[PDB]
Amino acid sequence: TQSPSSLSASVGDRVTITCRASQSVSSAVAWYQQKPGKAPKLLIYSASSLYSGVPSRFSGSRSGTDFTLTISSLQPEDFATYYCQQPWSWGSALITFGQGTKVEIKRTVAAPSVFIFPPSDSQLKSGTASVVCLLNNFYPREAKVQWKVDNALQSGNSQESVTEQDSKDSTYSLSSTLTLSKADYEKHKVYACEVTHQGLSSPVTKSFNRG
Amino acid sequence: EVQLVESGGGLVQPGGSLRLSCAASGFNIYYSSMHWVRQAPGKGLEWVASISPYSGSTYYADSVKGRFTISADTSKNTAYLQMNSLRAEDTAVYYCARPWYPWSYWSGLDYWGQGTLVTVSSASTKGPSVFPLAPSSKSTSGGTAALGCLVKDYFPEPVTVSWNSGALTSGVHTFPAVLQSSGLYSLSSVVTVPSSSLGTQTYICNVNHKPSNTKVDKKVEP
Amino acid sequence: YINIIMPSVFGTICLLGIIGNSTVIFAVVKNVPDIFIINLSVVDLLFLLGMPFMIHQLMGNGVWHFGETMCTLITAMDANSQFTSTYILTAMAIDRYLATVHPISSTKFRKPSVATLVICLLWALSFISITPVWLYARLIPFPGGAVGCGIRLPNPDTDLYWFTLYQFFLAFALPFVVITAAYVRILQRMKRQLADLEDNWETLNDNLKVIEKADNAAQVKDALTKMRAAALDAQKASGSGSPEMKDFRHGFDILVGQIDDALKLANEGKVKEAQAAAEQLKTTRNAYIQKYLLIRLRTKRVTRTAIAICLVFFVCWAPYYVLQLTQLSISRPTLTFVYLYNAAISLGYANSCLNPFVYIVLCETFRKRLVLSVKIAAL
Amino acid sequence: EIAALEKEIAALEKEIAALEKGSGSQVQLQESGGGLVQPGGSLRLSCAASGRTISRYAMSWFRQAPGKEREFVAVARRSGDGAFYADSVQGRFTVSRDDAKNTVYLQMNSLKPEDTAVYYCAIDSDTFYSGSYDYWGQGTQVTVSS
Ligand SMILES: Cc1ccc(NC(=O)C(C)C)cc1C1CCN(Cc2ccc(Oc3ccc(F)c(F)c3)cc2)CC1
């Protein structure tokens, strides 16, 4: 339903991950760490006790209806998605895992380079037109890609795909694909991709004309 | 050592039946609580079912109550999850987890299995369609130009996309596959190169799809 | 001033009534099960649409220069509201009565398709029950070119008795007995249920303390057995109210399961394990009250809002029927009687404004936004 | 009483924006704290936000050298989300917020002549930090030279 939240922090920082409960939490939350492609691992159980194999840097706090996970000295193996097991409320499921807080490497802001790829001649024979808008090497992750066709905003016919944070420069990448039928592709002339980012003063627009 | 080994995942059409097995070793499954947790591709953890073999009590999530039927076999030391009337959203990775004590599932699930992937889709095995995303002719003369091959409408995952048989690695970004509304996956693979090499260097994407045994080598030019 | 005071009073009722009832319909689309309230507001909406026409007759003091067909339609709509409103109020009372007294047999009945059909039947019975209005809605042969629009009974000196009583019996007497009887059986069941859930819950707390002091497997086994019977007893006891079955029933699957988990460990002789499993129930009890209190607070709001809407109608029109029945004994009205009769109708049609306001005021979320708007507008 | 009561009119709007406690509209920003400073000095800027509560939105910073574009400088997201800096200003600059005063500060240290520009402020209208800038201040000239 809700995407995992992002919490950018560097090595050596003190991070605090918080989940919010509907009632007074009483030592009933456990924090799970899941690296991409691995099964989750229990970090703190009973909301205050150390787990076996878990260093003392992890520690669970409890402030009102908010329970927090504290990492005293962030380490390069601690960059993963952290899930919170909500305290049980009557009528819900037995176990409910709250949304995750993805901890990622903090770095300087880089604006996204925008490229657009017009559909080829071969693809138009299949009866479908795909327009690809590329966002290259940007940080932070949050960005928005807008599709304009003859200055008309599209909606519900595009899919985005963001790569994982790069292992060398800690940047991202994105590509938006506008799927159109061959008949609808010829009805317009101007296709554009409007990109707005935290590091962009003004939206960056790249456009091409059919033919 | 506590180990949870799983199997049974695979392809199944909507409305089909699939029984997942979670073999448990290092402990007696009778005095334990086996919990099934699934994680949809790109989504968070979701709890599915639980069973206490010693007591026989069995809990289900709302979304799977009446469709799934979790059970345990103490003789074979395994826990089963019989799935019936599968839907599109039942596609996920199913983990089986147990708490330290059979009654401490509210303090955390200490031990987890490796997980099995269940893919529910009515589409048939279809090879990929490779389309070239030609680089812009009017790009930065001394800067960087990006080109790539669009792999569209293939099933099932994955397709291994490499450029020049692995000779080109710098600047290559193979985006995760996105499930189209028609049930067929599609991904892109763009590579950024200096514009001076467009007229001389040859860029060929090697799209390989094992399940269909399809090998495609496509050339991209302005 | 006094001569034109009465037409101005009814104009204020029309203005506030249309705005108030429109807000209620807008709020429900954007308490009662979102069906009877909309239909009840339609009755107010339709009646208030015909209100300005009758106000013109008051200024003319017996002038109906609008057409004979209009007189039959408008006068029927004025007399249609009393039957239609109480039938809907009776329907809402019975709908809440079945859902709280006979929930098993009313599960099929309580459907949006069925409920919508019932409203049309109530409107159909409303037009049939106002049959004398249709028969004697002809223009009164007032002297001169003016024509009155009233009820022209064949024997007004003698036929007045049955016409007045038949309206009082069907529109006020019969529904009041049904509604009051419905809401005393509802509150007896609700008080019995809400005294049952906390009675079985108090059985959990008393036994949950015994487990901690227990020193043998026999005490733990017997203590949990009392809890299990109380848990199952409270599970079936949830099926006695409408907003207490779809929310407070799913939780007991976990609670009964956890008692079985602890009870099974007690039979095995694992006394230490049984107490550890039993100690996990202090979070189930802690989640028992925090959900029960929210539901118990929510099940009073539904009943109080339903009763307040019903009680407003039968109190606004109560003084009017006091004078109407009294004038049967005292045929000749006095000077005070004229003022009292005018005051009776003013409170009678105030039901068009109190019902939308009472429903809005009792909604805690709705009134909160209005207070915030006043603070911003005050500046 | 005009002067004192107009300060209470501005004080009234502060409490009225507290009562708004949401989206509202039409937020005004005013830079300050610009002046000549020798290389290696220190300066602090400020932007007072009025008409809305910036405790729900992220306040960014931009600069524009003459004959150049508006390169990014720093962004100060909501408390607990951290602050990100551009490559050139990393280490030397520091942006901090004050939700109570609806004011953001750009604590600048170790200035260089290359940093001479107009430091335009901005408030991110989007609550997801998507970069939806819709309001700006007039900017304050900052020049570094001995
Ligand atoms: C007893 C009762 C109970 C309920 C309703 N239905 C509602 O309460 C709605 C839910 C809002 C209607 C009635 C009677 C219907 C027959 N009625 C006769 C009458 C009409 C008109 C008039 O003279 C005015 C003419 C114009 C006016 F605007 C006016 F206020 C009075 C005198 C007398 C008396 C009321």
Numbering used by the authors:
A (entry chain L): 6 to 216
B (entry chain H): 4 to 225
C (entry chain R): 107 to 136, 145 to 493
D (entry chain N): -24 to 52, 52A, 53 to 82, 82A, 82B, 82C, 83 to 100, 100a, ...
Please quote the authors directly.
Mammalian melanin-concentrating hormone (MCH) is a cyclic peptide pivotal in regulating various physiological processes, including but not limited to feeding behavior, energy homeostasis, sleep-wake cycles, cognitive functions, emotional states, and nociception.
To elucidate the mechanism of MCHR1 antagonism, we endeavored to solve the structure of the inactive-state MCHR1 bound to the selective antagonist SNAP-94847. To this end, we employed a previously established approach, engineering the human MCHR1 by introducing an mBRIL fragment between TM5 and TM6 to replace the ICL3 in a rigid manner, while fusing a K3 helix along with an ALFA tag to the H8 helix. To bridge mBRIL and the H8-K3-ALFA helix, we incorporated specific components, including an anti-BRIL Fab (Fab1B3), and a bivalent glue molecule featured by an N-terminal E3 helix followed by anti-Fab and anti-ALFA nanobodies (NbFab and NbALFA). The structure was resolved in two different states at resolutions of 3.33 Å and 3.43 Å, respectively. Despite variations in the overall conformation of the entire complex, the conformation of MCHR1 remains largely constant in these two states, exhibiting a typical inactive conformation compared to the active structure. The cryo-EM map of S1 state allowed unambiguous assignment of the majority of MCHR1, with additional density observed within the transmembrane helices, attributed to SNAP-94847. The antagonist SNAP-94847 can be divided into three functional groups, a 4-(2-methylphenyl)piperidine scaffold (R1), an isobutyramido group (R2), and a 4-(3,4-difluorophenoxy)benzyl group (R3), which collectively bind into a hydrophobic pocket surrounded by TMs 1, 2, 3, 6, and 7. Its binding occurs deeper within the TM7 domain compared to MCH, with its R2 group penetrating inward by approximately 7.5 Å relative to R11 of MCH. Specifically, while the tertiary amine of SNAP-94847 is anchored by D1923.32, the methylphenyl group at the C4 position of the piperidine group tightly packs against W6.48 of MCHR1, preventing the conformational changes of W6.48 and nearby residues, thus blocking MCHR1 activation.
